[PDB]
């Protein structure tokens, strides 16, 4: 055939891939974390948006830290050979490098490590997108006039 370029990810596999949305609204009282009013609006918007991009969307609500880790492990061990990409959206409380399960924190590195090139072979070479709505600390941006 003619000249070929290799500058863009192959996104014409039979499936776009999974879009896992973890929507943590209500937290165990002992954590002292507030209910995240408005997050269901986010979860519904994401579900519709990624549906229209042809992702296989799975919405999960109010997962403990243990449930988050088991979900990521399980999802990373699925057959992704027919899938172009992987998307995970995390909606929760957080701190730098951390997102909260309903009963306590999870290191983001623990979640994303399941999908490493050497640990998730059916996603090797494929884009792995993590979308994180959570605090990264307590600084406030005062802005500047333009």
């Amino acid at each position: 055939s003619g000249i070929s370029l290799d500058n863009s990810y192959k996104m014409d596999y039979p499936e776009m891939g999974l879009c896992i949305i973890i929507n943590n609204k209500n937290f165990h009282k002992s954590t002292g974390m507030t209910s995240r009013s408005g997050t269901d609006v986010d979860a519904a918007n994401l579900r519709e948006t990624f549906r229209n991009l042809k992702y296989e969307v799975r919405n999960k609500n109010d997962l403990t830290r243990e449930e988050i880790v088991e979900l990521m492990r399980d999802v990373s061990k699925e057959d992704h050979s027919k899938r172009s990409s992987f998307v995970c959206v995390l909606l929760s409380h957080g701190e730098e490098g951390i997102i909260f399960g309903t009963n306590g924190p999870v290191d983001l590195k623990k979640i994303t490590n399941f999908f490493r090139g050497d640990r998730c072979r059916y996603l090797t070479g494929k884009p792995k997108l993590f979308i994180i709505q959570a605090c990264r600390g307590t600084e406030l941006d005062c802005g500047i006039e333009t």
């Binding site: 290799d6 500058n7 863009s8 990810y9 996104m11 014409d12 776009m16 995240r36 009013s37 408005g38 997050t39 609006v41 986010d42 918007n45 994401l46 519709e48 948006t49 990624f50 229209n52 991009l53 990409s85 959206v89 909606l91 957080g94 730098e96 994303t112 999908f115 490493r116 090139g117 050497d118 640990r119 996603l123 090797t124 070479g125 494929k126 884009p127 792995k128 997108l129 993590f130 979308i131 994180i132 709505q133 959570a134 605090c135 990264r136 600390g137 307590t138 600084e139 406030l140 941006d141 005062c142 802005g143």
Partner: protein, 101 residues
């Protein structure tokens, strides 16, 4: 270059993209009625541009939308009139378009 078979391996951290709602060290803002500033803006820009723009360009539009259109309102002076910028962290090795063919 001393290893043409270098291309036989890729880094285990390659091909990840982390679309953070906010800059390192910062709070992230969520409106109780409208949803979070970032997710609101992300969905709007994907709906408008996923059949048109490469993903990093979509996320740059999200950065601009969050940066320009949102400012907090609070009765607490500490939390009032604050701004947010999201933070695109890319270890991708290729351009990403959600459409094909």
């Amino acid at each position: 270059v001393d290893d043409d078979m270098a291309c036989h391996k890729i880094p285990v951290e390659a091909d990840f993209l982390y679309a953070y709602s906010t800059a390192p060290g910062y709070y992230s803002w969520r409106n109780s009625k409208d949803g979070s500033w970032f997710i609101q803006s992300l969905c709007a820009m994907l709906k408008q541009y996923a059949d048109k723009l490469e993903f990093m360009h979509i996320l740059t539009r999200v950065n601009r939308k969050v940066a320009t259109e949102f400012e907090s309102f609070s009765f607490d002076a500490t939390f009032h009139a604050k701004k947010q910028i999201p933070c695109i962290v890319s270890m991708l090795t290729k351009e990403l378009y959600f459409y094909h063919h």
